[PDB]
Amino acid sequence: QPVVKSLLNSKGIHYNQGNPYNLLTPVIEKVKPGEQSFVGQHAATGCVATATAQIMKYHNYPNKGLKDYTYTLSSNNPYFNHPKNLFAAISTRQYNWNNILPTYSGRESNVQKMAISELMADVGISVDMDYGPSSGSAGSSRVQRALKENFGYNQSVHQINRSDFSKQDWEAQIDKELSQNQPVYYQGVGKVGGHAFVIDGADGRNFYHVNWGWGGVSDGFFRLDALNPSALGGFNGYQSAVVGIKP
Ligand SMILES: N#C[C@H](Cc1cccc(N=[S@@](=O)(F)N2CCC(C(N)=O)CC2)c1)NC(=O)OCc1ccccc1
């Protein structure tokens, strides 16, 4: 195993799901029965969209979108009135990656805040995001499609499932991407549900650096079968990844 210092940290890339990243997500319309109300608030960007956007910022690509996308919200969603359709005019987008900053603390211009909110909403719509105070997505299977068809990433983009490999071969896939200066999309499921994040480093002793997409919270080094962030209370089952992410 090679040693690779965290690729996202080297570029100051630290995104989150709340403000100002979610200023263009759908505004919540209903109160989930018996729950405290989130009406009038923008939905979370979703960890699937945050992890993908962090990878896209690392490559600063694309300058122009390739294809629009539309989908209909799941009728199960208790936060919006149905039927609810969402649309992103990605094919007309001129992404200004000099306005899409590596991280936001609130001191930024509104041109810069709207630039990252544009990307976060475009990416989220591209992966059929189930919006809410927390926002969910199928993850890897839609990330690989969206990066290729909507944003024109390389044909090398594809999803790999943990159940298809030995432990050695699975880690070898991750190690190859990192040594190519290519961060890796990753996701897993725990008792509380699933989460999507980014692998961008390796300690050379089977610990991997993780960017959970929570603005830096619990970021550090973890083993692939012990992805237990302290912010939870792990995402070690049904693990999948998207590799070969490059222009
Ligand atoms: N931010 C953010 C969201 C947080 C969130 C929001 C709502 C529900 C939820 N829990 S889920 O119950 F829906 N869960 C259990 C069953 C699993 C399965 N059987 O595939 C799917 C995942 C998690 N994260 C995310 O969307 O997880 C992507 C992901 C997708 C597949 C696998 C791993 C991760």
Which experimental approach was used here? X-ray
Identify the sign of the CA torsion 50, 129, 43, 187.
negative
**Is 158 one of the annotated active-site residues of the chain?**
no
Contact 40, 27 (CB under 8 A): yes
Distance 192 CA to ligand 1 centre (A): 9
The resolution of the experimental structure, rounded to one decimal in Å, is 2.0
Identify the sign of the CA torsion 238, 163, 150, 246.
positive
Classify strands 158-161 and 237-243 as parallel, antiparallel or unpaired. Answer: antiparallel
Q: Which has the closest alpha carbon to 4: 228, 181, 219?
A: 181
- The protein residue whose alpha carbon is closest to atom 15 in ligand 1 is 193
Cα(75)–Cα(219) distance, rounded to whole angstroms? Answer: 35
Task: Single out the catalytic residue among 42, 47, 82, 209.
Answer: 47
Q: Which has the closest alpha carbon to 51: 247, 244, 226, 241?
A: 241
Contact 118, 49 (CB under 8 A): no
Ligand-binding site membership of 144 (annotated): no
- The protein residue whose alpha carbon is closest to atom 3 in ligand 1 is 136
Distance 47 CA to ligand 1 centre (A): 9
Cα(144)–Cα(148) distance, rounded to whole angstroms? Answer: 6
